[PDB]
């Protein structure tokens, strides 16, 4: 799709802004140690290493 | 409603709904009234500005051309043209005329009439070709509405999402409600890029796929009429017209 | 203003702003002075570099072609050419001159004048076709300016967004200045996708559509003039010219 | 062809966001910092 | 099945899976039910809506053309046409009749038979060219199905990722449920890009490559039959036909 | 320098820089060494590998066409050709030779010499058309350099950005300097998209725009020289040549 | 090598590596085994599935056209054709034979040989144009392999990225070392985009650039041999052939 694919330029823009939002939230919101060490446990099963 | 379209719409519904239900979601979480209004309302607005009103009046006939059943008449008309040739080889001026009088295909009737009236080969070619060109242009003009709706829909999707974010990040009162709230704003994107790829851009493809069959039957009829005028034998007529059949 | 454009602009405003107000926003929020400068300033910049200045003076004329309303004269002109075809055979070429003396369509008036003056078929074809090609090229050049602004506006949106992020991170230490940036980020995105997919790319489609109709009327008049010069009968003229009418 | 780039950028950026959505899902929040932005961001809409 | 395809599938499996298994992952994690259902089910739905049902039955024949092993028989047919050219120089067309009969290439057999029947050279060109263009259209119709699947699959991947995120943002608090979802986001991307790029777009490419060889052999046979009818000398015939072979 | 380009660069610079400076951020924050080196150095490298050395020496000549001020004198040339069309008819062709001598347009001067030397009309058309085809190819080759440079620059940015993010992601152990690090990474994206959209891809448009205007003047003279050979009367010549003026 | 390619590779390596090293880090972090294996192995797999094996053996010959330094002898061959035109005019065609007996250019040697053997002008044009068309098709087939490698490589980078993350998120392990591990995963996307936009897609451009130069020389030789058959004067021959030179 030659001009149909035009919307992608806009998409990239939308996800860039959201990338900006979350990254800052991770900035200085120091990670709860329990939550993370727990998250490693939350995923390990799915990918099964 | 052709069987491929019916199975396609069934499979499309099962794919997207199954993709949410099988991982713990529910249909009541995918429906969002405002997102439908922004995406569908916006698509309709962009298409209406894009085309004159008389084009939009035609849109019903586009869907009828897409979803009408195949009935493969071309195998019958091939025998009719050979029969007409076999008569033109003997007493062409008069006998041909009677055979076509009540024939169900208008383009063949009028084509033969130009030969009965004794018009020269390059002029019967020219008049016939103008009628085929008109049919080809008409079917292209149907597909162009769908292809255009399919382009605008995804972008009107993103307008929906950005407007939703604009409203949430405004009033980010409760940090626990950020996740549940920002999820809804992305519903619109899914309407845009899902409607475009399972309905609009598809129906555009089918309209083009079916114009390509109707025009080829008209080209066969044209080659039949000019072969009848040349006084070709039945073997050569059949040898030639079969190139259009599959 | 054509009726489809008026209904389209009504539907677009009601869908997008009605959606936003229904989810509780405020219209004033969707205004950002800095984002207007980056996006709308940017598109003007790129379009002015892209095209010679004389093209930009044509831009006013383009909007008139798109949003002028239809009056569908073509049925009248078809009856005129059939009448004129009959007169040529019965009273000779000379009388045509009287009939075409005041016809309000210039292209037909000349085409006939070239036949009365006695010019040969391939040269009258050549001169008429040059006039049609010139009209087609003129309308294409109007459409190209809009299509091009529609290309550059979305990208100027992403320029604006990235400029937004720099300012916010540049002023992230003070989280109390975070907001003024999130606005400019989104609104620069919003102005991009909106302007391009509702004001620019839609107008381009109308110019190309409302041209294609004008070119088809000129091709009908050319086939009328050539068929009049042949001395074709009224049934052949009416049949041939009808292929151009929808 | 001039749009060769977007289909790659969009794919790459998305992957970061899925990651940082996780990271912010493995982190606590600052009490006043969140408000510092919340009051300001609200005022941006010109409330 | 075929040598370049077999080495390609071996290299693809060893590169992609050998990369992952070496890094210390398990192949088990590369399967996620909902990701498969959205991407593959959505792709199949879009293709079924887009094409008539009879086209889908051609999909078997498309694959068979793509992975057909190479036959060098064009060299033999060049020597056959040169021999027949020398028969036409020496002997009456009746001798061609025996020579052409029973050749395993039907397009050549028919072409020569049209020359033995004494049919006129521009008519022999016309009827032969109809058969070439029919074969070209048939192979194009196969390739277009695979190209369509390769276009839809990436967009269904974007739907799967957005649907995944909608789920993960729902649960920014419950760590246990987060894992199952963030996966579907990652995997639905992987099936969309990987299936499109390795399976679909290569098979489309290969059908077009193998079609181009088939059509070049038909063009050479047409130049052979016409040069036999003209009565060209064998040295010049050999020169013309050799330009088609590489 | 050309007035539309000058106004465009003024508006673009005020648009982008004025947008930033309204929010108070220093231009020194928007300037980066490594982002410039990766995006511009990468673009130069990609273009140098892409083309032979001799085409890069044409880059100077390409810019000189696009920003050349309009001084088009096509109206004057149409009067010269119509005058000769009547002198040639009255006096005989020898008088043309004197009049054509010293005319500043070389294509017109040469053409008439072909007609004075009595060369046949299809040969005159052939030689003149070879010269127009050469000029059309030359201007296309200029535009292709910038068009290419505008497709490499954004992708070079994704390289600069990824190298930045590779670094920043090293600092996920501390939110210290995490932000200011991400800001710099995205600067490379900004130079890629901004240069492609506002400089490289626009200049391509101008080369193609101004090329098309020049070729239209040359096609007018080809109709001028051929109408002088045919001996068409002054009113008919004036009609034909006016179709080329806009 | 071609001087522009050498300077391009110097500039590209200095831009990418110099940019990276200037902002910090070490080159020892930019080389990663599994990322190279997935991107290059995956590209090779997709290309091998895409083409017959015989096309891939042409890939060596493709690079030679791209990086072959120009011999630019065409000016010498223009003087040969002008000399031969004068030889043919005085002596008759027999003398042409002796002059071209040792000419190093095969296409000219044959073209002339067909004219001295007294073949008809439409026949000599037809046979020579078949040879030019064959060379155009051959160079297109070389370019297409590199282009298609250039469109698979970025997407193999996305696959490599996702598989990198998937292994990580699996074994999340220590919370201080998350950053370095995800950072490496993005090395892959770098190889995908860098290879396609600096090595593969550029080489396609050179093969098409240098192909076009070669085809212009063959078209000049064709107009030369047709002009010597027609018996044009040296001034007219020189003028025609000069249109092909820049």
Numbering used by the authors:
A (entry chain G): 12 to 60
B (entry chain A), C (entry chain B), E (entry chain E), F (entry chain C), G (entry chain D): 1 to 246
D (entry chain F): 14 to 60
Structure paper excerpt:
Two types of membrane proteins, A and B subunits, form a stator complex. In this study, we purified the chimeric MotA1/MotB1 complex from the E. coli expression system without flagellar formation, performed its structural analysis by using cryo-electron microscopy (cryo-EM) single particle analysis, and present here three structures of the chimeric MotA1/MotB1 complex in the inactive state. Each structure is represented by a heteroheptamer composed of five MotA1 and two chimeric MotB1 molecules (A5B2) and chains A to G, having the same stoichiometry and topology as previously reported for the structures of stator complexes from other bacterial species.
The Class 1 structure exhibits high similarity to the CjMotA ring of previously reported stator complexes. In the Class 1 structure, the MotA1 ring has pseudo-pentagonal symmetry. There is a cavity between chains D and E of the PbMotA1 ring and chain F of MotB1, allowing solvent to access, from both the periplasmic and cytoplasmic sides, essential residues involved in H+ binding (Asp24). Furthermore, the plug helix bound to opposing sides of the MotA1 ring, by crossing the linker to their connecting TM helices.
